[PDB]
Design a protein around this nucleic acid. Structure first.
Ligand SMILES: Nc1nc2c(ncn2[C@H]2C[C@H](O)[C@@H](COP(=O)(O)O)O2)c(=O)[nH]1
Ligand SMILES: [Mg+2]
Ligand SMILES: [Zn+2]
Ligand SMILES: [Zn+2]
Lengths: 79, 98, 50, 1358
DNA sequence: CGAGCAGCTACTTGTGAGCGGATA
DNA sequence: TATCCGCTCACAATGCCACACGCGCTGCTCGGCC
RNA sequence: UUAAACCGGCGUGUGGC
C-alpha cells in the first residue's frame, strides 16, 4: 500500500499538477489499456499510476511526449 | 442507513431524505466549503451535480461505473434550471450567453 | 434561561433538556403544589421561638 | 459550455414567447379521470403530456406518431420532462404593479418618478388619483389627487384633462417619461446646486437612469401585463386519498388570482358600477402582489391554520429556499452514517467500515467486477446474487475496497479538517471504526456522535482524496504551526506513567546493554518499569549533508524510556525522550520529528507511539480511588481561620465602622486568599506524602498519587479542577455576575450543603446554556466570514511591489504577549532584512523565512521587519504568492491557486467554540479605578517618549502638555519590550534616555479630574473673568479657601455665552512670556465646568495644575468583548461615544457656540479651512487653542472607531489596530491564531472605494466603485498625460461587503435576496462567473484547486 | 353539476436605512 | 430651507440527524366552449 | 406494418450531537 504521497509532491510541485498527471495517467491505464511500468501488488489503478509517477517515470512533460508519440503512431497507421 | 439509488423528488431531481423512505444523506453547505478549501473540483461536481442532481447525468454515471469506466460528464444541474424557471416566471428575465 | 434563587423547592435547577431550550422546559420539584390562584407553593416546617 | 450569465428585465412579448398556451380557468383537473382541464392550471396542450410518449386521448401511442399533435387536443406527444421547461401565462384585463420595485426600500419606481412611496401606495389602492397631460391647467402633472380633489378639479378642465387611476396611470406615466432630457436636466442641476443629501440623491437618480439608457431596458416593463405561471412539475398535486389532498402552496394563490381575473373580465362587460370594478381591481392587485411576495403587504394573507401562503419570493429566500436548500447543499445518494468506534491496532492512514454499508455503498463496482468475471451474464443475475448474500460476493468486496478511499465527514463542519479521506477495512457490526488519534481533529467525542461517509466514485475523485484529502497529508494545523495530531489523554497518560521514575524499584542500579534487553527484563518481571539504570544507546544525528552519524553512548535513564526508544526513529535525538512525557513535551517532540525527519516516518512514528501507549496503559495500573485523593490536613484549620476573620468583619460592620461596599470588597479578596492558600496546600499534599526509602532513610520523589499522575501529565485533569475537587470549590456568582459574599466551604470528597449545591447548579446552568446558545451566533459569524472571503485566489508568483507592513511584537499592556517570530515565521519580506549593524543584508527581498531564518533573526535581535501583507498587495483580483507567506501546514513556500480565504475564515471561525457569547464583565465588574492603577516596569532599559511635548518643573519631575505621548522601553540590545500610555500632565520622575532599573515608580497618576500644566513659570491673574457673568460664587466648607466654579455651556445664559474664561501667564510687569521657540502669546482658554482653586497674584510653578475639571469617574461604555466583540469588529459599528480625531494638521480653534452643538475650526498652515465638524458637549476635550496637533491626534478621550481612523491615519494603522485588538481578544481566552487570516479578511473588507475628483475618468464622484477596477482603469489613464482620479478607500462591515460585489449570484445566496435581485435586474448586470461560490452553484470546476489549472486552459482558450 | 369560497398578539433584539419632522 | 432627531419598517437569526402526528364540515354561488 | 429486449411539500412537537 501507499501510506503518504508527500514524496510525490516534493518532485512534482504545487501538489495540484500531480492531480492532473495522475488523472491522465490512470485514465490511460484503465480505459486506454496501457501497461503498468512497475510490477503491481494487485492494487487499484489510481495507486499504481501514483506509484509509477513516484518512480520518476511519469510527469506532465513525458506524458505530453508519450501523447505526441501516440499521435505519430496514429499518423503512421492511417498512412 | 445506506442508499445506492432510490426515489427522487419530482419538483427537483434530488434524492429524498430519511430512513423511513430510501433516502440518502444531505451534503451540507459547510461540507461544500470544506471541499472548496481543498481542491476536488472534479469531486465536487461529481457529488453535487452527477451523484445528486441530473437524472440524465447520474444514469450515465451509473452505466459507466457498471461498465468499467471511471469517466464522468457533469453537464448542468437540473435544480439550477428550476431556479432559472422560477426567477424567469417573474418580470425578471435571465439568459445564458454563448 | 437562568434560574432564580426563588426556585428553591419549586423548580428543579439540575433537570433541563440540553440543546435548543435550556431552562425554558423545567421539572416540578417533589413537594411542589399548585396554588388556588395558580402559583407555586412549598411546604415548610413552622418553627416557633424555641 | 456557456459563458457569463446575463440578467435583465422581462418584456411581455418575451413572456408570450415563453408561454405555450393561455390558462383561462381555475379548474385544476377533471374529476372522474385525472386528465388535466382543457385550459385549467394543469394542462397538456399548454405544458405537455402527462405520460412518456402518451397523449391525453390515447389516440397516438406508438413511436411513429412521436412528434405530432392530435385532432382535438393538439398536444405534441413527448416525455414528461417537457412539463418542466414549458410554461404558460395569464392574460390580465387590468395591468398590475410588481411589488419588488414598490417596497424594496429604496424603491425603483418611486425613485424613477421622483415621488415618495406613500403617494404611489395611495394611488395604486384607489384611495387617490394621479393626473397626466396637464397642459393649460393650473395643476402639476406628477401630483396626486384624492376623490374630492378629482371631484372639484373635474369641472375646470373636462376634455384636455386626463386622470387615469391604477396601474394604467403608472404605465402611462412610464411611457411618456423621457430619459435623455431627464439625464441632461439632472446633470445641469448637479452642476448648479451645492448640497450633500441633494447631491447624493441626484447621483443615485442619475445612476438609476444611466442603467436604463445604457442597457436595453424599458420602464414600462416594470408594470406587469401577463402573469407567467410555474410549470406543474414544480408545484405537484400528488394522490393523497380522499377529499384530503397533498398540495403545494402556490396553487391556491393561482386559483384565487385566476378567479379574480375572470370576475374582473366578466364585470367590465356587464357595465358594472365603477366602484365595484375598482374594488375588483384592488382585490386583483392584492392577490398579485401577495403572490409575488407575501408579507410585504400591510397584512400577510393566509390559507389555513393561520399559516401565511408561501409566495415565489418566499420560495427563494430563507433556509428552505433554493439558494440554501437545493442549490448549495444537496443530498447525495451514496452516503452512509453511523457511530464512531476506536481502533487501537489500525494504522493512522487507514480506518474501519461496516460490512453492510460497504455492500450498499459499492453496488455498481461489485456489479462491474461480476460482469467482468464469467459469473453473471446479465445485471439481473448479479443483482439477485448480491441480494441473496452469497459468499462469492465477499472476495469481490475485498478486491474493490482494497485501495478505494472514502470520504469521512462530520455533521457540523467548522474547518477544512472536518472532512477527510480514509482507507476502509471491513469490520463486522454496524458502527464505523475510526482512528483515535484523528478524533481530536474532528472535535467529536464518542458520546453518541454520528458521522457520515461518501464515496469518490471517480478516478479523479479517488486520486484527489488520496492526494489532497488523506489523513497523512493533513497533520499540521491550517491556523498555526502546531500539529493537529497531538496525542490524547490515554496514550500520554500511559507514556507519563511509563517514564515517571521512582527512587527504589526492582532492578535498581544495574546495567543494561540495549533497549531490547530492557524490554525483555520488563516482560520477565525481574525489573520494574521505572528504575534509574545505566544503559547504552545507539543514536543517529543528521549532518550538514545527507548523512547519518551513528554514535553509541551511555546514559542514565529508566527502563520505560529505554523501551520507548525502540519506537523513536534514528534521526531524533535522545534528549527528546529522556524526560517525563507530557502533552506539550510530546507535542514539541512530534514537531521536531516532522521538522527533521519530514513527513514519511512521522506518521509511522506517531502510530507506534499510540500503539505502545495503549499497550503500556493496559499493562499499567492507573486508576482513581478514595485513598488516591487525600484531604489537606490544614484545610479545616484554614477554613476556621477564615470563619473567624469574616466574623471579625461582621463585628466591625455591626459596630458601624465599615459600610456595605467596602465589606463586599473586603470579604471577597479575603476568601480568595483563603482559597489560594488551601489550593497551594492541596497542591503540596499532591506532590508529596509518598516518601519511599532506597536502602536506608526516607527519600522524596515526584510523589505521584495515581490522580496527580493524570493532572500533572496534562492528559485530562487541570490544576483548578482538582483544586475544586479536593480543596474548596471556590467563590460562586449570581446571574448578573456579582460574586456572592458567601463562598462554598466544602469540597467533593466531603458532603455538600443543599444551599451550596443550589448556588452551584445555578452558576453551572448558565455555563451550560452558554455553548448551546452561542453555537448559533458562531455558525452565523463563520457563515458571514466565509461569504466575505473566498473571492480570491493566489495567482501571481511575485509583483515586485515593496509596499508592506512592519511587524512588531505585542509589547503594549503586559510585559510580553507573543514574540515576533510567531508573527513572522513563514512570511516573505517586502524589504530586505537588515542586521543589528546597519547596511548588512542577511536576508534579501522576496524570500521565505524558514525556522532557521527566524532563529538567526532572534539571534540578531531584530525589532522591526518590513514584510509583505495582503492588505498592502498591488495585484488585481487575487494575491501574489510572494505576498502571503507560508501554508502553516507544509514546510515550503505557499503554492499558486489555493484559496487562502476559506482557510482564513475557517481558522477564525473555529476557535469560537472556546469563546464566550456573553460575559459577567469585560474589564472587571467593579468600576475601573480613576487613575489609581499601580502598574510598574519589570525590565531594565532606556526610556523613550513618542511625540515629545513636555517640560520640566522646579521639583525635578517632568510634566507633559500632550495626551498621545507614549512611553517605551528600549532594552540594552535595542528592541522595545515595554510600552504604556502617558496621562495628561502626569508626574514623570525620570527623563528621556535614562537607564533605570526594573521595579521603580517611574510615573504617577492624576485623578479623574483633569489637570493642566504650566509649561513656564510666571504670574496668574483673572484676565477676562468678571465676577457675576462667567464665574459664580461657591464657597468651600472644609478648606475655607473658596473655589470659583465656572458654569458650563449648557447652564449659562446668553449673557455669558459670548465670553470664555482664560488664564494669561504674565511676568511681574505684565508682559506675556513666550513659548520657547515660538512667537505665540501664551494663554490657556478654560472650558466649562472648571474649578479655579488658584487665586490671583500668586507666583505659579512649572507643571502645577491650575483648574480641576470634573469627569465621568465610573461611567464606562466598554464593549461586551466576547464573540460579539469580533462580530462588532468585523461589522465596523460606530461606538456609543466615538472619539473624533483630527483629520487635518495645523492649529485648532473654536467657532460659533451652541449652534445645536459646538463647532470646531482647524486652520492649517498650507491652505484654508474648509473642514468643519459638529462636536457634542458631553465629552472631555483634550486639545486646546494653543496646542498644534498632527493629523490623527485625539480630541476627546474614549473608544476609537475604524471609519475615521482609516482616512486620517492611513491603511496600515487601521488594520494594525484591528489585528492588535482581535489578537488581544483571542489571547485573553488562550487561543493562538496567526494574524494572516485577519489581514486577508480586513483586506477583503476595504475592497470598495470612492472617488473625490473624477478628472479624465468615466466614473462620477458619487460612485462607490471597487478598488481594483479603478486601479486598472486609472492605469490606462496614467499612461497618457491625463490624470486618472482621486480614489479614497472606505471600510464597511462584513454584511454590506458581500452585497457590494460585481457578481450578483454570490450575493443572492447571502441574505437580502430580493433587493440584490432587483438591483441586478434593473441594471442588466452580467457577471463573468469568475468566483468560487458562483462556480459551485452553476456546477462546474473551481478555480482554486485542480480546476484552477483547467480554468487557466479555459482562460487561454477563450 | 362540479368546484371554490367561506362561515361556523401583545417580552426578540439588534442593525440598518428610509421617511417625516422640527427647529433654527 | 438646510441638519440632525426621532418614527417606522425590513431582514436576520449554527448545522445536521432521529422519531412521531395531522393537512376539516357543509352550505352557497359562480363557472358556463363537449 | 411485423419480430425481440427493458422500464417528503409544509407545519408542529420531542429527542440527540
Ligand atoms: N359523442 C361524443 N361525446 C364526447 C366527445 N368528447 C367528449 N364527449 C363526452 C364525454 C364526456 O364525459 C362529456 C363531457 O363531460 P364534462 O361535461 O366535461 O362529453 C366526442 O367527440 N363525442
Ligand atoms: Mg459528541
Ligand atoms: Zn390527443
Ligand atoms: Zn502581492
Amino acid at each position: 500500500a501507499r501510506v503518504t504521497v508527500q514524496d510525490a509532491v516534493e518532485k512534482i510541485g504545487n501538489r495540484f499538477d500531480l492531480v492532473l498527471v495522475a488523472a491522465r495517467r490512470a485514465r490511460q491505464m484503465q480505459v486506454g489499456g496501457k501497461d503498468p511500468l512497475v510490477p503491481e501488488e494487485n492494487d487499484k489503478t489510481t495507486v499504481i499510476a501514483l506509484r509509477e509517477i513516484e518512480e520518476g517515470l511519469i510527469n506532465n512533460q513525458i506524458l505530453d511526449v508519450r501523447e505526441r508519440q501516440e499521435q505519430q503512431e496514429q499518423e503512421a497507421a492511417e498512412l | 442507513h445506506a442508499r445506492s439509488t432510490g426515489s427522487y423528488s419530482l419538483v427537483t431531481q434530488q434524492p429524498l431524505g430519511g430512513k423511513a423512505q430510501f433516502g440518502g444523506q444531505r451534503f451540507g453547505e459547510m461540507e461544500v466549503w470544506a471541499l472548496e478549501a481543498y481542491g476536488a473540483a472534479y469531486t465536487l461536481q461529481e457529488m453535487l451535480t452527477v451523484k445528486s442532481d441530473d437524472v440524465n447525468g447520474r444514469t450515465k454515471m451509473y452505466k459507466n461505473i457498471v461498465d468499467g469506466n471511471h469517466q464522468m460528464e457533469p453537464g448542468m444541474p437540473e435544480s439550477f434550471n428550476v431556479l432559472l424557471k422560477e426567477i424567469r416566471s417573474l418580470g425578471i428575465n435571465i439568459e445564458l450567453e454563448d | 434561561r437562568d434560574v432564580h434563587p426563588t426556585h428553591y423547592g419549586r423548580v428543579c435547577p439540575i433537570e433541563t433538556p440540553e440543546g435548543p431550550n435550556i431552562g425554558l422546559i423545567n421539572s416540578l420539584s417533589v413537594y411542589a403544589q399548585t396554588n388556588e390562584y395558580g402559583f407555586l407553593e412549598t411546604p415548610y416546617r413552622k418553627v416557633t421561638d424555641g | 459550455e456557456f459563458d457569463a450569465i446575463k440578467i435583465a428585465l422581462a418584456s411581455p412579448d418575451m413572456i408570450r414567447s415563453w408561454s405555450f398556451g393561455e390558462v383561462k380557468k381555475p379548474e385544476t383537473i377533471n374529476y372522474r379521470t385525472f386528465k388535466p382541464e382543457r385550459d385549467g392550471l394543469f394542462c397538456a396542450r399548454i405544458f405537455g403530456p402527462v405520460k412518456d410518449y402518451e397523449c391525453l386521448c390515447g389516440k397516438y401511442k406508438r413511436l411513429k406518431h412521436r412528434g405530432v399533435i392530435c385532432e382535438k387536443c393538439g398536444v405534441e406527444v413527448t416525455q414528461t420532462k417537457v412539463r418542466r421547461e414549458r410554461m404558460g401565462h395569464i392574460e390580465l384585463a387590468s395591468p398590475t404593479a410588481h411589488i419588488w420595485f414598490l417596497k424594496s426600500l429604496p424603491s425603483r419606481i418611486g425613485l424613477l418618478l421622483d415621488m415618495p412611496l406613500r403617494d404611489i401606495e395611495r394611488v395604486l389602492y384607489f384611495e387617490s388619483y394621479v393626473v397626466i397631460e396637464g397642459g393649460m391647467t393650473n395643476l402639476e402633472r406628477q401630483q396626486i389627487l384624492t376623490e374630492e380633489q378629482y371631484l372639484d378639479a373635474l369641472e375646470e378642465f373636462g376634455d384636455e384633462f386626463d386622470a387615469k387611476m391604477g396601474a394604467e396611470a403608472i404605465q402611462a406615466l412610464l411611457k411618456s417619461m423621457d430619459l435623455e432630457q431627464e439625464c441632461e436636466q439632472l446633470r445641469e442641476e448637479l452642476n448648479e446646486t451645492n448640497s450633500e443629501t441633494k447631491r447624493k440623491k441626484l447621483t443615485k437618480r442619475i445612476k438609476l437612469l444611466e442603467a436604463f439608457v445604457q442597457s436595453g431596458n424599458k420602464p414600462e416593463w416594470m408594470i406587469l401585463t401577463v402573469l407567467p405561471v410555474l410549470p406543474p412539475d414544480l408545484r405537484p398535486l400528488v394522490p393523497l386519498d380522499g377529499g384530503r389532498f397533498a398540495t403545494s402552496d402556490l396553487n391556491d394563490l393561482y386559483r384565487r388570482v385566476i378567479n379574480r381575473n375572470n370576475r374582473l373580465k366578466r364585470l367590465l362587460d356587464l357595465a358594472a358600477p365603477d366602484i365595484i370594478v375598482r374594488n375588483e381591481k384592488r382585490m386583483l392587485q392584492e392577490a398579485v402582489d401577495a403572490l409575488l411576495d407575501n408579507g410585504r403587504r400591510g397584512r400577510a394573507i393566509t390559507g389555513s391554520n393561520k399559516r401565511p401562503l408561501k409566495s415565489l419570493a418566499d420560495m427563494i429566500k430563507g433556509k428552505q429556499g433554493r439558494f440554501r436548500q437545493n442549490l448549495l447543499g444537496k443530498r447525495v445518494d451514496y452516503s452512509g452514517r453511523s457511530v464512531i468506534t476506536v481502533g487501537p491496532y489500525l494504522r493512522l492512514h487507514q480506518c474501519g467500515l461496516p460490512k453492510k454499508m460497504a455492500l450498499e455503498l459499492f453496488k455498481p463496482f461489485i456489479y462491474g467486477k461480476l460482469e467482468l468475471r464469467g459469473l453473471a451474464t446479465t445485471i439481473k443475475a448479479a443483482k439477485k446474487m448480491v441480494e441473496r448474500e452469497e459468499a462469492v460476493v465477499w472476495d469481490i468486496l475485498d478486491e474493490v475496497i482494497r485501495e478505494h478511499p472514502v470520504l469521512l465527514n462530520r455533521a457540523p463542519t467548522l474547518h477544512r479538517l472536518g472532512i477527510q479521506a480514509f482507507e476502509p477495512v471491513l469490520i463486522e457490526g454496524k458502527a464505523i471504526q475510526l482512528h483515535p488519534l484523528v478524533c481530536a481533529a474532528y472535535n467529536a467525542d464518542f458520546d453518541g456522535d454520528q458521522m457520515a461517509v461518501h464515496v469518490p466514485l471517480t478516478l479523479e475523485a479517488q486520486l484527489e482524496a488520496r492526494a489532497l484529502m488523506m489523513s497523512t497529508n493533513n497533520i499540521l494545523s491550517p491556523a498555526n504551526g502546531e500539529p493537529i495530531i497531538v496525542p490524547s489523554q490515554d496514550v500520554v497518560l500511559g507514556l507519563y506513567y511509563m517514564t515517571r521514575d521512582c527512587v527504589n524499584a526492582k532492578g535498581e542500579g544495574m546495567v543494561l546493554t540495549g533497549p531490547k534487553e530492557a524490554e525483555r527484563l520488563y516482560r520477565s518481571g525481574l525489573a520494574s518499569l521505572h528504575a534509574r539504570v545505566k544503559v547504552r544507546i545507539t543514536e543517529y544525528e543528521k549532518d550538514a549533508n545527507g548523512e547519518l552519524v551513528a554514535k553509541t553512548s551511555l546514559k542514565d535513564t529508566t527502563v520505560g524510556r529505554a523501551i520507548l526508544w525502540m519506537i523513536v526513529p534514528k534521526g531524533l535525538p535522545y534528549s527528546i525522550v529522556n524526560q517525563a512525557l507530557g502533552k506539550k513535551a510530546i507535542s514539541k517532540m512530534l514537531n521536531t520529528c516532522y521538522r527533521i525527519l519530514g513527513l514519511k516516518p512521522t506518521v509511522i512514528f506517531a502510530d507506534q507511539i499510540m500503539y505502545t501507549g495503549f499497550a503500556y496503559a493496559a499493562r499499567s495500573g492507573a486508576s482513581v480511588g478514595i485513598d488516591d485523593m487525600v484531604i489537606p490536613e490544614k484545610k479545616h484549620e484554614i477554613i476556621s481561620e477564615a470563619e473567624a476573620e469574616v466574623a471579625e468583619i461582621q463585628e466591625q460592620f455591626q459596630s458601624g465602622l465599615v459600610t456595605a461596599g467596602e465589606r463586599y470588597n473586603k470579604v471577597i479578596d479575603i476568601w480568595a486568599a483563603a482559597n489560594d492558600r488551601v489550593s497551594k496546600a492541596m497542591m503540596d499534599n499532591l506532590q508529596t506524602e509518598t516518601v519511599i526509602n532506597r536502602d536506608g532513610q526516607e527519600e522524596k520523589q515526584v510523589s505521584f498519587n495515581s490522580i496527580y499522575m493524570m493532572a500533572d501529565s496534562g492528559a485530562r485533569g487541570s490544576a483548578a479542577q482538582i483544586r475544586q475537587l479536593a480543596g474548596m470549590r471556590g467563590l460562586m456568582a449570581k446571574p448578573d455576575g456579582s460574586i456572592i459574599e458567601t463562598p462554598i466551604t466544602a469540597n467533593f470528597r466531603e458532603g455538600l450543603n443543599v444551599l451550596q449545591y443550589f448556588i452551584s447548579t445555578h452558576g453551572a446552568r448558565k455555563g451550560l446554556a452558554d455553548t448551546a446558545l452561542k453555537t448559533a451566533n458562531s455558525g452565523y459569524l463563520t457563515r458571514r466570514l466565509v461569504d466575505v472571503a473566498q473571492d480570491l485566489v493566489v495567482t501571481e508568483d511575485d509583483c515586485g511591489t515593496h509596499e508592506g507592513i512592519m511587524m512588531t511584537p505585542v509589547i503594549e499592556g503586559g510585559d510580553v504577549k507573543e514574540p515576533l517570530r510567531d508573527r513572522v515565521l513563514g512570511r516573505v519580506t517586502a524589504e530586505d532584512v537588515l542586521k543589528p549593524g546597519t547596511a548588512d543584508i542577511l536576508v534579501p527581498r522576496n524570500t521565505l523565512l524558514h525556522e532557521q531564518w527566524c532563529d538567526l533573526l532572534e539571534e540578531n535581535s531584530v525589532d522591526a521587519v518590513k514584510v509583505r501583507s495582503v492588505v498592502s498587495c498591488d495585484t488585481d483580483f487575487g494575491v501574489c504568492a510572494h505576498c502571503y507567506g507560508r501554508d502553516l501546514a507544509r514546510g515550503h513556500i505557499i503554492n499558486k491557486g489555493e484559496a487562502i480565504g476559506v482557510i482564513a475564515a475557517q481558522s477564525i471561525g473555529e476557535p469560537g467554540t472556546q469563546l464566550t457569547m456573553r460575559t459577567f464583565h469585560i474589564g472587571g465588574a467593579a468600576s475601573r479605578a480613576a487613575a489609581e492603577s499601580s502598574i510598574q516596569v519589570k525590565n531594565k532599559g532606556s526610556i523613550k517618549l513618542s511625540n515629545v511635548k513636555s517640560v520640566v518643573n522646579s521639583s525635578g519631575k517632568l510634566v507633559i502638555t500632550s495626551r498621545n505621548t507614549e512611553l517605551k522601553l528600549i532594552d540594552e540590545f535595542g528592541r522595545t519590550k515595554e510600552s504604556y500610555k502617558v496621562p495628561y500632565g502626569a508626574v514623570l520622575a525620570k527623563g528621556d534616555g535614562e537607564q533605570v532599573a526594573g521595579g521603580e515608580t517611574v510615573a504617577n497618576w492624576d485623578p479623574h479630574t483633569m489637570p493642566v500644566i504650566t509649561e513656564v513659570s510666571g504670574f496668574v491673574r483673572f484676565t477676562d473673568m468678571i465676577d457675576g457673568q462667567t464665574i459664580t460664587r461657591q464657597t468651600d466648607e472644609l478648606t475655607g479657601l473658596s473655589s470659583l466654579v465656572v458654569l458650563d455651556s449648557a447652564e449659562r445664559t446668553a449673557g455669558g455665552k459670548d465670553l470664555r474664561p482664560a488664564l494669561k501667564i504674565v511676568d511681574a510687569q505684565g508682559n506675556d512670556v513666550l513659548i520657547p521657540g515660538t512667537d505665540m502669546p501664551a494663554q490657556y482658554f478654560l472650558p466649562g465646568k472648571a474649578i479655579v482653586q488658584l487665586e490671583d497674584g500668586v507666583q505659579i510653578s512649572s507643571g502645577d495644575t491650575l483648574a480641576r475639571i470634573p469627569q465621568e469617574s465610573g461611567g464606562t461604555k466598554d464593549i461586551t468583548g466576547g464573540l460579539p466583540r469580533v462580530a462588532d469588529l468585523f461589522e465596523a459599528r460606530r461606538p456609543k461615544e466615538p472619539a473624533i480625531l483630527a483629520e487635518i494638521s495645523g492649529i485648532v480653534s473654536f467657532g460659533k457656540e451652541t449652534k445645536g452643538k459646538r463647532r470646531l475650526v482647524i486652520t492649517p498652515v498650507d491652505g484654508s479651512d474648509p473642514y468643519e465638524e459638529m462636536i457634542p458637549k458631553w465629552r472631555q476635550l483634550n486639545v486646546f487653542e494653543g496646542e498644534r496637533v498632527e493629523r490623527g491626534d485625539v480630541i476627546s478621550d474614549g473608544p476609537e472607531a475604524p471609519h475615521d481612523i482609516l482616512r486620517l491615519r492611513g491603511v496600515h494603522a487601521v488594520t494594525r489596530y484591528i489585528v492588535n485588538e482581535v489578537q488581544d481578544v483571542y489571547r485573553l481566552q488562550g487561543v493562538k491564531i496567526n494574524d494572516k487570516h485577519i489581514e486577508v479578511i480586513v483586506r477583503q473588507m476595504l475592497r470598495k472605494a470612492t472617488i473625490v475628483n473624477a478628472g479624465s475618468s468615466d466614473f462620477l464622484e458619487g460612485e462607490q466603485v471597487e478598488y481594483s477596477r479603478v486601479k486598472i482603469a486609472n492605469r490606462e489613464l496614467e499612461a497618457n498625460g491625463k490624470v486618472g482620479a482621486t480614489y479614497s478607500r472606505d471600510l464597511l462591515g462584513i454584511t454590506k461587503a458581500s452585497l457590494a460585489t460585481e457578481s450578483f449570484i454570490s450575493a443572492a445566496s447571502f441574505q437580502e435576496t430580493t433587493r440584490v435581485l432587483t438591483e441586478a435586474a434593473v441594471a442588466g448586470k452580467r457577471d463573468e462567473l469568475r468566483g468560487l461560490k458562483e462556480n459551485v452553484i452553476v456546477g462546474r470546476l473551481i478555480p482554486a484547486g485542480t480546476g484552477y489549472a483547467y480554468h487557466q486552459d479555459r482562460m487561454r482558450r477563450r
